[PDB]
Amino acid sequence: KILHRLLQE
Amino acid sequence: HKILHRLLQE
Amino acid sequence: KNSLALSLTADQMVSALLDAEPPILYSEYDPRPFSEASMMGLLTNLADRELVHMINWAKRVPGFVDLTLHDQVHLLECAWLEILMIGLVWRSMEHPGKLLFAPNLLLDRNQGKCVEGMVEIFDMLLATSSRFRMMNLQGEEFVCLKSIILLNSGVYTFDHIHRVLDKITDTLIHLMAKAGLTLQQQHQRLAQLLLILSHIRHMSNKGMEHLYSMKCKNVVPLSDLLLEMLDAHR
Amino acid sequence: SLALSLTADQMVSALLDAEPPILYSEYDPTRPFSEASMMGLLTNLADRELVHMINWAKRVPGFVDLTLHDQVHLLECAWLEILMIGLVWRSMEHPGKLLFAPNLLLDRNQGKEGMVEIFDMLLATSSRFRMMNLQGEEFVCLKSIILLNSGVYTFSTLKSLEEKDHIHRVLDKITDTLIHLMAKAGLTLQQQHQRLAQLLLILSHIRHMSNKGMEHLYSMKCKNVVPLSDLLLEMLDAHR
Ligand SMILES: CC(C)(c1cc(Cl)c(O)c(Cl)c1)c1cc(Cl)c(O)c(Cl)c1
Ligand SMILES: CC(C)(c1cc(Cl)c(O)c(Cl)c1)c1cc(Cl)c(O)c(Cl)c1
Numbered sequence A: 001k002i003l004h005r006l007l008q009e
Numbered sequence B: 001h002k003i004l005h006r007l008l009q010e
Numbered sequence C: 001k002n003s004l005a006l007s008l009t010a011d012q013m014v015s016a017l018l019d020a021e022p023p024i025l026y027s028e029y030d031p032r033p034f035s036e037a038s039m040m041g042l043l044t045n046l047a048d049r050e051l052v053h054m055i056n057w058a059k060r061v062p063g064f065v066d067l068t069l070h071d072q073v074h075l076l077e078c079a080w081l082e083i084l085m086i087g088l089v090w091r092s093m094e095h096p097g098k099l100l101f102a103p104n105l106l107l108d109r110n111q112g113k114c115v116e117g118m119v120e121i122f123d124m125l126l127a128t129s130s131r132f133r134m135m136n137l138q139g140e141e142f143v144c145l146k147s148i149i150l151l152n153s154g155v156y157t158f159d160h161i162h163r164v165l166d167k168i169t170d171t172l173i174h175l176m177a178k179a180g181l182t183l184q185q186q187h188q189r190l191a192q193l194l195l196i197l198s199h200i201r202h203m204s205n206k207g208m209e210h211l212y213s214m215k216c217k218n219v220v221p222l223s224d225l226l227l228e229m230l231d232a233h234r
Numbered sequence D: 001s002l003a004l005s006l007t008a009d010q011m012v013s014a015l016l017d018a019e020p021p022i023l024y025s026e027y028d029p030t031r032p033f034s035e036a037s038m039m040g041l042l043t044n045l046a047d048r049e050l051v052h053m054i055n056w057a058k059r060v061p062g063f064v065d066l067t068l069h070d071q072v073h074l075l076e077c078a079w080l081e082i083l084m085i086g087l088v089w090r091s092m093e094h095p096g097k098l099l100f101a102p103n104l105l106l107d108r109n110q111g112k113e114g115m116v117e118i119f120d121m122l123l124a125t126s127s128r129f130r131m132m133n134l135q136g137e138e139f140v141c142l143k144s145i146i147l148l149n150s151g152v153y154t155f156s157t158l159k160s161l162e163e164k165d166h167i168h169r170v171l172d173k174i175t176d177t178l179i180h181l182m183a184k185a186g187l188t189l190q191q192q193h194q195r196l197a198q199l200l201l202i203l204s205h206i207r208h209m210s211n212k213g214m215e216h217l218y219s220m221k222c223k224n225v226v227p228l229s230d231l232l233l234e235m236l237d238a239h240r
Helices: A002-008 B003-007 C010-020 C036-058 C069-091 C109-113 C119-135 C139-152 C160-178 C183-217 C224-231 D008-018 D035-057 D068-090 D115-132 D136-149 D162-184 D189-223 D230-237
Strands: C099-102 C105-107 D097-101 D104-107
Touching (some): A002 D035, A002 D230, B003 C069, B003 C224, C010 C139, C010 C160, C036 C069, C036 C099, C036 C224, C069 C099, C069 C139, C069 C183, C069 C224, C099 C119, C109 C119, C119 C183, C139 C160, C160 D189, C183 C224, C183 D136, C183 D162, D008 D162, D035 D068, D035 D097, D035 D230, D068 D097, D068 D115, D068 D230, D115 D189, D136 D162, D136 D189, D162 D189
Antiparallel strands (some): C099 C105, D097 D104
């Protein structure tokens, strides 16, 4: 999920 | 016409 | 034009609020509800009776009767479900995992599934009850919080009210000081309690949505009063 | 935890430091706008703001201490409240208008459907901020409280409850920070408690506006006339 991705990047 | 309007006055 | 509420002392306010408390009502002794129909039949009947008591409770909250009839209507229309919910969560405090809708209607989350969309609300209520319990919420604090909801929830969708709200804040601090909390504990606890009001609002909003869906699913007729309180939330 | 070790002044400086930028819309005064496109401007803006918010959250003391799972939850729960409080803050000095962007200042008139109700609430909240003379230092504290508080009672076993205790300790730190600010402003102790209550009670109304807005977003999505970004659809979805 996008939010998940952005929180990690 | 609200029931609330009446109950508040009763 | 001056309100008696502002001239009261912290103890007079607390005693007034304690004295205004409505009674704990019972569910019909029939139906152990395992159907959607019987479940919502019992809960809506109970809510109906609780509302009448809540309206007469509100009239006894210092400063409330000083508002115009239209303002009183607006405040109650906005806060009614929040007020029912905080009462439920309070009554359920000494019953971990259980929701005490009435002394003879103590339900758990299993109960909730027998009504499409209800277990989610039950879980939020139970979580709040547990939070209250761990905070060791006192009854004197509870009645202050319930009155804050009545006066606050609808106040920005409109001075006197804010003064009364301030008085109640003073009253809450007065109670915590009386209980021997340090200054830092006083402001921290006040914050913790008021932050829970955000969650109570959230639960009310979600509950209002659920109540609306149940109205359209038409598995049980609602009273004219309950329908008008629901309709106020457009 | 560096978070629990910060002083009032350090917390204030940290939060001020992490403030995201104010972005511009694609609004063009000469270009005609329907109900759709106007909403297309707002959803486009919100989408971009969300990326910045996500990165702002990482800089809020204590937030990164939490599991990815918990970080996701808090943001999914708080995102609209956070956008809304920022909007209300930016609009404080523009009575009767909402400053979505420096180049997009709307009034209730340009409420076109169901958005007018939400506009009215946001305006009312801005008016309240104005009435209270809300300060920037108070604002950043409130915004961080929203991130940490909104989802904390809707999160397992006995562990993963320590996750919650940490959040409550950070929250307490932010309360201390608020009190410190008011004290420095020469408020009497009675005035400090009263103002703290007034500020925290606003959070109840922000929650209300967020839930009403989430309903409105869902209806716009179902009408399929207003374009919604993928990120926005996912955040909306998290509210069911
Ligand atoms: C019936 C009602 C309004 C209710 C709320 C409270 Cl707090 C209460 O105490 C009582 Cl005797 C009744 C209710 C409850 C739930 Cl759990 C619900 O999902 C929906 Cl749609 C409505
Ligand atoms: C597009 C969105 C999410 C929004 C909110 C904020 Cl607070 C914001 O700053 C930006 Cl730029 C976009 C929004 C706007 C309105 Cl008026 C509305 O009624 C709903 Cl339901 C959602």
